Symmetry: C2
Subunit: 148 residues, 2 copies
């Protein structure tokens, strides 16, 4: 529920790496293709995310990816606290489901683009705008943040 | 005023290129350092922006940067219409002022980072969160979009 919580995880496709951040309360996704799973790339991604949305806490399914000096520095600078492990019945499998949908969409649009990174961003667009009298992830995140 | 309007412009520093998008109604910025001013880089940036915020119209101070096949394709796919020239007294010099503040902040934090791109993202964070009983650009954009 808390509006400041994001979960970050990397997945691999076509020998490339996709960093996926899910705003847990809304299902909204920010994703980028990165050359390798480095702390450098993770630190940079986090600084960008934090300058765009109010990020209070980051969760992950791989805690070791947040141990590098570069990543610690980014979270320190941006005022981000980390959770040890993952705390919540209301969000059970939400992050799993969102990554599943994103992967599924990427599959559906992949042949329209030359580059995986292009297909990923198309999939992000599609995901964030998809209506479930229901709302999209993009509409949900704005309402959650606006409500303060 | 209209909540779907963004202005995109490139600036150069340290022999590198900074793409800056300002949400005109709020002053909110998304910016990235790109290797060269290519249509490829602009197209990709636009697809990303469009998947994160509701982008209806793009303005620019350099219209030729939106003529390439790649950029036209991105705007077509994302449903983005372009303005010929720039239409508005309420927003007079808003984009100019925001680029000016961003440049000023980049200057203030530049020595804290090795890479320009890092300094740019720190500057974006600082800009978006800065309170002018006033609000920040980040608070303004969410309220504008939430109000529908
Ligand atoms: C929506 C959209 C927008 C542009 C393109 C597109 C790409 C994509 O790569 C980028 C330029 C976006 C980096 C691509 O991967 O095909 C590339 C390499 N070349 C193009 C050439 C002409 C027209 C469009 C594209 C393809 C799609 C599906
Ligand atoms: C807030 C923050 C976060 C991390 C860093 C940082 C960078 C920056 O580059 C990235 C890793 C972010 C790509 C840098 O440009 O200095 C680099 C190259 N190396 C580092 C090594 C150790 C600790 C921090 C950094 C510097 C700052 C100011």
């Amino acid at each position: 529920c808390s509006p400041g919580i994001w979960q970050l995880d990397c997945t691999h496709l076509e020998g490339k790496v996709i960093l996926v951040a899910v705003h847990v309360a809304s299902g909204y996704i920010e994703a980028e293709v990165i050359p390798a799973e480095t702390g450098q790339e993770t630190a940079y991604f986090l600084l960008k995310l934090a300058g765009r949305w109010p990020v209070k806490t980051v969760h992950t399914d791989n805690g070791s990816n947040f141990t590098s000096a570069t990543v610690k520095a980014a979270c320190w600078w941006a005022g981000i606290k980390q959770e040890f492990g993952i705390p919540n019945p209301q969000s059970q499998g939400v992050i799993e489901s969102m990554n599943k949908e994103l992967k599924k969409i990427i599959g559906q649009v992949r042949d329209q683009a030359e580059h995986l990174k292009t297909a990923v961003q198309m999939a992000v667009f599609i995901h964030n705008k998809k209506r479930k009298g229901g709302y999209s992830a993009g509409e949900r995140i704005v309402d959650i943040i606006a409500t303060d």
